[PDB]
Write a protein that binds this ligand. Structure first.
Ligand code: ACO
Length: 213
């Protein structure tokens, strides 16, 4: 298992990895936006920009060369959220608004930039480990490695939208604090029908945070 940067060359490698793996993400699942093998071009654009910040780590299989997992890291800045919410209005895909409305509202509703007095935040945004290679403590390694990329680039706060409770555990293990905790059940539409019908054990979404060097 080898942990290194992601060259410009391996970007559609990564996308074809995400297509085939990342769709069974808890939140995604409960609204159903993206699906195995088929492109989800909407998100794939965000991910392409996050990748171009060039802080993003990958795990390659020593012996086969196959893409095992990735941590996509991006620089968040003041007003980024507010821009995303304004841009989200013009976009007219209801599923997308349910996912990212929750994410951006929750984030916006705790000014972390003000809380910790910082102008940029290191964001572990997307954490993918292939179906095949999943459960061998690879995420935990990607996470730890992501934390150290932050300290090398002189960031002060690392933050993660921990929708998966496995991702919460990893964060717990590196000593991350829960900033906001929100239950997926709490959100019901005009009828009273649950909007995030999440399958256990992912009963809540945590924004989680660690202060670094
Ligand atoms: C819609 C959006 O874009 S929101 C984006 C936000 N989402 C995320 O960042 C998370 C999404 N990522 C995923 O869904 C991935 O498929 C992952 C996280 C499941 C893959 O991670 P893995 O390689 O399985 O993690 P790893 O194998 O290192 O396990 C680490 C921790 O998870 C726990 N864990 C992992 N898999 C399981 C499981 N199946 N059951 C119970 N616990 C598990 C381990 O016990 C460990 O916790 P510990 O520190 O208490 O031991």
């Amino acid at each position: 298992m080898e942990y290194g940067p992601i060259p410009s060359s391996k970007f559609t490698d990564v996308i074809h990895h995400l297509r085939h793996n990342f769709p069974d993400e808890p939140l995604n699942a409960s609204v159903g936006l993206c699906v195995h093998g088929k492109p989800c071009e909407l998100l794939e654009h965000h991910d392409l920009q996050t990748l171009e910040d060039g802080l993003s780590i990958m795990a390659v299989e020593s012996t086969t060369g196959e893409i095992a997992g990735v941590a996509l890291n991006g620089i968040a800045r003041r007003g980024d959220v507010e821009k995303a919410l304004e841009e989200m209005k013009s976009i007219d895909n209801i599923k997308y608004q349910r996912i990212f409305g929750l994410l951006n509202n929750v984030n916006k509703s705790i000014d972390l930039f003000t809380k910790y007095n910082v102008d940029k935040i290191f964001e572990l945004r997307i954490l993918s480990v292939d179906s095949r290679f999943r459960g061998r403590g690879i995420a935990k390694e990607l996470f730890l490695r992501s934390e150290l990329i932050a300290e090398e680039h002189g960031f002060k706060l690392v933050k993660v939208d921990a929708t998966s409770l496995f991702t919460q555990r990893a964060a717990e293990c590196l000593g991350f604090i829960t900033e906001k905790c929100v239950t997926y059940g709490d959100f019901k539409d005009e009828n009273g029908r649950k909007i995030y019908d999440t399958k256990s054990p992912h009963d809540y979404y945590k924004v989680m945070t660690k202060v670094v060097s």
